[PDB]
Paper text:
Excessive replication of Saccharomyces cerevisiae Ty1 retrotransposons is regulated by Copy Number Control, a process requiring the p22/p18 protein produced from a sub-genomic transcript initiated within Ty1 GAG. To minimize genomic damage, p22/p18 interrupts virus-like particle function by interaction with Gag. Thus, p22 is identical to the C-terminal half of Gag-p49 and is processed at the C-terminus by PR to generate a mature protein p18, that is identical to the C-terminal half of mature capsid Gag-p4525,27. The structure comprises an all α-helical domain related to that observed in the CA-CTD of the yeast Ty3 retrotransposon, ARC proteins, and orthoretroviruses.
We determined the crystal structures of p18mAUG1 and p18mAUG2 expressed in E. coli. The p18mAUG2 structure was solved by multi-wavelength anomalous diffraction (MAD) using crystals of Se-Met substituted protein. In both structures, the asymmetric unit (ASU) comprises three copies of the p18m monomer. The structural superposition of all six copies, three from the p18mAUG1 structure and three from the p18mAUG2 structure, have an RMSD of <0.25 Å for all pairwise alignments overall Cα atom positions. There is no additional density for residues 249 to 259 that constitute the additional N-terminal sequence difference between AUG1 and AUG2. Therefore, we consider both structures to be identical, and define p18m as residues M259-N355 (p18mAUG2) and representing the minimal domain required for CNC activity. The co-expression results show that regions of Gag required for CNC comprise residues M249-N355 in p18mAUG1 or M259-N355 in p18mAUG2 and imply that the nucleic acid chaperone domain of Gag is not required for CNC. Inspection of the p18m crystal structures revealed three monomers in the ASU, each forming two dimer interfaces. Dimer-1 involves a largely hydrophobic interaction between the exposed surfaces of α1 and α3 on two opposing monomers whereas the Dimer-2 interaction is through the side chains of residues exposed on the exterior of α4 and α5. The application of this model gave a much-improved best fit that comprised p18m monomers in a tightly associating monomer-dimer equilibrium, KD(1-2) of 0.73 µM, together with a weakly associating dimer-tetramer equilibrium, KD(2-4) of 43.2 µM.
Numbering used by the authors:
A (entry chain B): 261 to 352
B (entry chain A): 261 to 351
The structure:
Amino acid sequence: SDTQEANDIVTLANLQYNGSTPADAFETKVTNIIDRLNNNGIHINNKVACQLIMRGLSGEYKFLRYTRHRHLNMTVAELFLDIHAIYEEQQG
Amino acid sequence: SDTQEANDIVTLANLQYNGSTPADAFETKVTNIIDRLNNNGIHINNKVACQLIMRGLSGEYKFLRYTRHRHLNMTVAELFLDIHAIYEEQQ
């Protein structure tokens, strides 16, 4: 698409996760955005990506943005492992 | 700042210009964001940058997002020359 990169950036900058969408969908959604932008030459590294993910991460997931200060060199895969583990406990 | 690039992206993705802020401030604001992101490795070329500027460009500046289809290879400097010319005539 001619307007692909712009639409991926706007989606990435306005992520809103609370626990309604399954973690499976939300992960692949963000992972695809980062991969699509990187294929077009826009590299969003782990540091900048994690910051944008934790931004808007609300509900019972708000705390991940608080502990992030101790978490530098964090990876996107690690950040989603945290979100997944919370979703598992949200189903039961 | 440790959170500079992320804050630059959110600002670039939620630009809202109507004609209240002077074009001088709005131009240097966006131009600095693009330069900072390119220096940090987040390459935002003219095509994607202009698209993001025209997004949220509302008020009497809406029509620039309509003519953008005939305007390919339009540089950021060219897009602001348009915005400037509308701002000068607005007062």
